[PDB]
Amino acid sequence: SKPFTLPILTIGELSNSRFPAPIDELYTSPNEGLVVQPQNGRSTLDGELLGTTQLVPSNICSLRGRINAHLPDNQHRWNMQVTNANGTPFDPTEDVPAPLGTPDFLANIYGVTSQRNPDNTCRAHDGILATWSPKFTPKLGSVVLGTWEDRDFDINQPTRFTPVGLYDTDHFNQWALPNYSGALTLNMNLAPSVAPLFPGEQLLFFRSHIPLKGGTSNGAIDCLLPQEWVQHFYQESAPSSTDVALIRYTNPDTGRVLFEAKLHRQGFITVANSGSRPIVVPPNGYFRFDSWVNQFYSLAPM
Amino acid sequence: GSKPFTLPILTIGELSNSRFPAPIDELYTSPNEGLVVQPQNGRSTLDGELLGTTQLVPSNICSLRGRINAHLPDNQHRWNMQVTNANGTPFDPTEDVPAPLGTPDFLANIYGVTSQRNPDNTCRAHDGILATWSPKFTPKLGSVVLGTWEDRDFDINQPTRFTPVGLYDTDHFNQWALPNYSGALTLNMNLAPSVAPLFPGEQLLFFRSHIPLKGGTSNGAIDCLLPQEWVQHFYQESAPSSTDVALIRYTNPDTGRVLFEAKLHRQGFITVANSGSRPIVVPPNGYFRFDSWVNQFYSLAPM
């Protein structure tokens, strides 16, 4: 078989796969009572992308298309038809939950909506992508973008939303999926929920504290795999010999090993740990693949 | 045996700009008559030695982070920021880089958002400008100025980050003009070298993005020598280069149909046999594949 590998990347060299941001720390938590089912940053270990996951980092939580209308309310809102990169409208019959890169959490996402016309005249206005809105219907090919009172966009010109962070904390829940087709509809083609199946284990996350325009929050976005691991597995396509890869967080200069973890075939990590805490790792260290083990493998407790 | 050199399996719609956070929109070639082409982001040798200000994390391209340390005494709503490493230690100007890694490598009014989060999780963010042409843009000395608008304030000595979005306007915009990383009347140091064709009848080939512009008229073109994914691939692979020039061919893997060929130079840039300034259209499913080690005297099939 083509041997399985992880990329040689320290924590300061990793990116979040659910929001455009550097990884700030590793984190573990029980997430009691919640369903953990992110749709970005989802890949099998042998490189099959899942959910809404795609490879281009600047397309994470970005959508593009053409603005088609200014809405007749007092909220300064603009409807956008979502397109592919070639300008063709999104096809709702594609077996994805939503256009690739669509945000996978409820929030008021602060960002900038920009346009460039064929004659190279441009405009951009900061504002909000409300992923909880009844008119957030990206699987139907349309979303609404907000800005402020005095701002206009051009109808039917190429349009892009660049995400920046959270506008505020209203509606923010990183583990609540949007209704990709709007109210009273079921999401489809989802990457499965993930949970520890072995006793004494918790998920391990790659955490970013993303920007927040106003309010009080740690802004935590937890991904199952950093974007670089998604990219690596996609390129490598190494066969998964068992359901679980044993990985160890290692300092390459001294060989000192900090802890060990289970990297599951479906693309997430578990550790033997209790409670919600940040993990501190050596700045020069990174996970190394050790061996393929079985699901009942007992990890050394952190 | 030596590890074979390879390019990643990535179509043009799967590539990223290495000089600005943006997808690649097209390939582009140009003689760039009379200009010195010397970008500092998106620079790597084929064997994976990063050069200039190049670093691996895509969301850190044209970002700076640190701690705001002063509100400046004019009507311009400008804030001085001490640049830091991720752990909060100040940037060390004696590091043999031109500037902190990921620092912008072109003159512009860059539109973005400056955000803060205090230890007690209280936050604030305000849009505004990073003016890389300003006398106060001195990232190699560990400080830059950030603008916002009236009656917007930041906390002194709290963690701060600038997220770039695009161009604020076109004033001072020149993608091939390097900043003065240490300010007025200083020389830039530790630069990745300028690049140009070495063989007659060739031009550079660029991976081009049209980045956002807040107001004005411009195609917003940012041309990189290597997409960010190729920088990332070479860094991981570290395959030794057998000669100074790799012959690469833009190929559709479904049919084997080859569109054109190019030279991928050891120092990390591409040339093609072409004349004139024009975008290039490629098959959506195609990508460059490494064909063979040639050398600089290899005569390319004309595009």
Residue numbers in the entry:
A (entry chain A): 224 to 525
B (entry chain B): 223 to 525
Sentences from the paper on this structure:
HV was the first GII.1 virus detected in 1977 (15), noro485 (GII.1) was discovered in ~2005 (16), and SMV (GII.2) was identified in 1982 (17). HV, noro485, and SMV P domains diffracted to 1.86, 1.50, and 1.60 Å resolutions, respectively. The equivalent residues in the HV P domain were Cys345, Arg346, Asp375, and Gly438; in noro485, they were Cys345, Arg346, Asp375, and Gly438; and in SMV, they were Asn352, Arg353, Asp382, and Gly445. In the noro485 and SMV structures, Asp375 and Asp382, respectively, were pointing ~180° away from the fucose, whereas in the HV structure, Asp375 was missing because of the lack of electron density. Additionally, in the noro485 P domain structure, the polypeptide backbone of the loop hosting Asp375 (termed loop A) superimposed poorly onto the corresponding GII. Moreover, a neighboring loop (termed loop B) may have influenced the orientation and stability of loop A. For example, in noro485, loop B was oriented differently from that of GII. However, our new data indicate that Asp375 in HV, Asp375 in noro485, and Asp382 in SMV are unable to participate in the stabilization of the fucose moiety of HBGAs because of their flexibility or suboptimal orientation.
The norovirus genome contains three open reading frames (ORF1 to 3), where ORF1 encodes the nonstructural proteins, ORF2 encodes the capsid protein (VP1), and ORF3 encodes a minor structural protein (VP2). The S domain forms a scaffold surrounding the viral RNA, whereas the P domain contains the determinants of strain diversity and recognition of attachment factors. There is considerable antigenic drift among human noroviruses, and new genetic variants evolve every other year, which can result in new epidemics worldwide. It is well known that human noroviruses bind with various specificities to histo-blood group antigens (HBGAs), which are present in saliva, on the surface of epithelial cells, and in mucosal secretions. To elucidate the constraints on non-HBGA binders from a structural perspective, we determined the X-ray crystal structures of the capsid-protruding domains (P domains) of two GII.1 (HV and noro485) nonbinders and one GII.2 (SMV) HBGA nonbinder.
